[PDB]
Amino acid sequence: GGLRRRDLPADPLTLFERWLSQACEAKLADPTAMVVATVDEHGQPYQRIVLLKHYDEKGMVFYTNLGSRKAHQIENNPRVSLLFPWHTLERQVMVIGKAERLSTLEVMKYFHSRPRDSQIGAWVSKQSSRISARGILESKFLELKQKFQQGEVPLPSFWGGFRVSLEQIEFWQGGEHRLHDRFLYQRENDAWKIDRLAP
Amino acid sequence: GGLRRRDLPADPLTLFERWLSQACEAKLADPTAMVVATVDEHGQPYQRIVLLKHYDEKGMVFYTNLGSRKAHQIENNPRVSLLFPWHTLERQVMVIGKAERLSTLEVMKYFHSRPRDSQIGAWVSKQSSRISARGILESKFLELKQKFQQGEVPLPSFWGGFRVSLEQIEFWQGGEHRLHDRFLYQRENDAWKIDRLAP
Numbered sequence: 001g002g003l004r005r006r007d008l009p010a011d012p013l014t015l016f017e018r019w020l021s022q023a024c025e026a027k028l029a030d031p032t033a034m035v036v037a038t039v040d041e042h043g044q045p046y047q048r049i050v051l052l053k054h055y056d057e058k059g060m061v062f063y064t065n066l067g068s069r070k071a072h073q074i075e076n077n078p079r080v081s082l083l084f085p086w087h088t089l090e091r092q093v094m095v096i097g098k099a100e101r102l103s104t105l106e107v108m109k110y111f112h113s114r115p116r117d118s119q120i121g122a123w124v125s126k127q128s129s130r131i132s133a134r135g136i137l138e139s140k141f142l143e144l145k146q147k148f149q150q151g152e153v154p155l156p157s158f159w160g161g162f163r164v165s166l167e168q169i170e171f172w173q174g175g176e177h178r179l180h181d182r183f184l185y186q187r188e189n190d191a192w193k194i195d196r197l198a199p
Numbered sequence: 200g201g202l203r204r205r206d207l208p209a210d211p212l213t214l215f216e217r218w219l220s221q222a223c224e225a226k227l228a229d230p231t232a233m234v235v236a237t238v239d240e241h242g243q244p245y246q247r248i249v250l251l252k253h254y255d256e257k258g259m260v261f262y263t264n265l266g267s268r269k270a271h272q273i274e275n276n277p278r279v280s281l282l283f284p285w286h287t288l289e290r291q292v293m294v295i296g297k298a299e300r301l302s303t304l305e306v307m308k309y310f311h312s313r314p315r316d317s318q319i320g321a322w323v324s325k326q327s328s329r330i331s332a333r334g335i336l337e338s339k340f341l342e343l344k345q346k347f348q349q350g351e352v353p354l355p356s357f358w359g360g361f362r363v364s365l366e367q368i369e370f371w372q373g374g375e376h377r378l379h380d381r382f383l384y385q386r387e388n389d390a391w392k393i394d395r396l397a398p
């Protein structure tokens with residue numbers, strides 16, 4: 001019970017790892033689910049949940065449709081925010097950094113790993129665009145589910161991924177009487193500067 | 200099972216209400232918890248969870264410390280995003296609008312309703328600012344817990360609230376084979392324009 005500075009690891013990822021791990025066993029729904037916030041050209045923020053798929057010193061990775069809104073927004077402003085809503089476990093992890101596209105080699109590797117039906121589904125949806133009916137989706141799906149016959153199901157060209165850099169990582173943990181613990185790890189030079197923040 | 204346009208209510212709030220209600224009985228942790236995203240002066244988005252406290256045609260309300268980061272950010276850019284992470288129930292509700300300060304009369308009304316200890320706590324924390332030790336919080340708290348003796352516990356002047364307007368409301372509900380249902384309600388003139396969006 002409690003979050004004291006003296007217990008903090010030098011690498012915020014160590015702490016994130018332990019927290020991610022504990023969330024998984026705690027059986028949280030989609031412990032890897034995180035809210036990614038992006039900003040459009042008019043300064044208006046936008047949010048949606050995506051799944052964390054990989055992470056290391058280079059940043060956190062998620063995959064998405066390259067014609068989607070989050071994608072157009074990242075292209076005009078690569079500054080993003082990630083928030084892991086683990087409040088059932090009285091925790092929050094917020095990441096701040098820049099989103100950079102993944103090479104086709106990486107994207108390719110991950111795509112040919114997800115459920116065959118999900119690969120077909122990736123083809124079906126022109127993510128974020130306005131469609132006149134649900135049926136359009138259902139048609140295309142069956143029209144491909146068999147057209148591909150599953151021969152391998154090709155990687156759609158409009159399917160990609162992003163790696164968000166770690167410029168800042170904030171940890172929040174529930175505190176009694178409303179006094180929560182907050183620590184901000186801030187990438188500075190070749191290291192991490194840590195500061196406690198008032199709740 | 201399924202989210203069809205023909206079943207949509209004319210007022211997005213009707214749907215939000217039903218969804219909020221079902222989440223509560225489903226016993227989700229903090230069904231009222233939502234992630235509010237704001238943007239700083241450099242175009243960098245920021246996120247944190249806050250609790251929805253009231254909502255109506257005028258917008259959604261939450262309270263916070265007026266010296267906090269979200270507050271400074273709203274002052275420079277009132278465009279915000281709210282996301283209710285109800286993915287355990289395979290749902291998402293995203294709200295887009297402008298944040299406007301609540302009058303002292305409203306703030307006052309709500310403040311003198313929360314747990315006495317939370318009112319004391321509101322005084323203790325200079326939210327978001329860097330503090331050198333947790334003890335600072337704990338000291339101030341006890342120093343006030345008794346100083347106020349609970350005489351009424353005055354409303355701190357640095358304690359306020361915001362009402363986010365409803366310019367857009369998006370509903371997302373889990374879909375089979377990766378084909379989720381998405382509907383965007385867009386405030387237009389004196390009404391709501393509804394469009395289905397590709398998943």
Ligand SMILES: Cc1cc2nc3c(=O)[nH]c(=O)nc-3n(C[C@H](O)[C@H](O)[C@H](O)COP(=O)(O)O)c2cc1C
Binds near residue numbers: 046063128286289398
């Ligand atoms: C638990 C969960 C996981 C999701 N994961 C992803 C993901 O990894 N990639 C993705 O593109 N969309 C994902 N979505 C759907 C997105 O929230 C969103 O609807 C979509 O990416 C389009 O957002 P955009 O229009 O802002 O670009 C997920 C939704 C939920 C509730």
Ligand SMILES: Cc1cc2nc3c(=O)[nH]c(=O)nc-3n(C[C@H](O)[C@H](O)[C@H](O)COP(=O)(O)O)c2cc1C
Binds near residue numbers: 087092249269326
């Ligand atoms: C379930 C939950 C509810 C919270 N509700 C609020 C709230 O209503 N108001 C608030 O100021 N902070 C709330 N917080 C703490 C915020 O997430 C955040 O730490 C704080 O407002 C400071 O953010 P800022 O530095 O971006 O301004 C809550 C955290 C959790 C996990």
Ligand SMILES: Cc1ncc(COP(=O)(O)O)c(C=O)c1O
Binds near residue numbers: 051
């Ligand atoms: C639209 C969409 N794309 C991508 C993903 C994540 O990739 P995968 O389906 O391989 O888990 C999800 C996960 O819920 C999703 O809903």
Ligand SMILES: Cc1ncc(COP(=O)(O)O)c(C=O)c1O
Binds near residue numbers: 178199262317
């Ligand atoms: C720092 C902080 N301020 C305000 C609130 C919400 O107001 P209240 O404590 O009256 O529920 C919360 C709720 O978790 C909180 O954590």
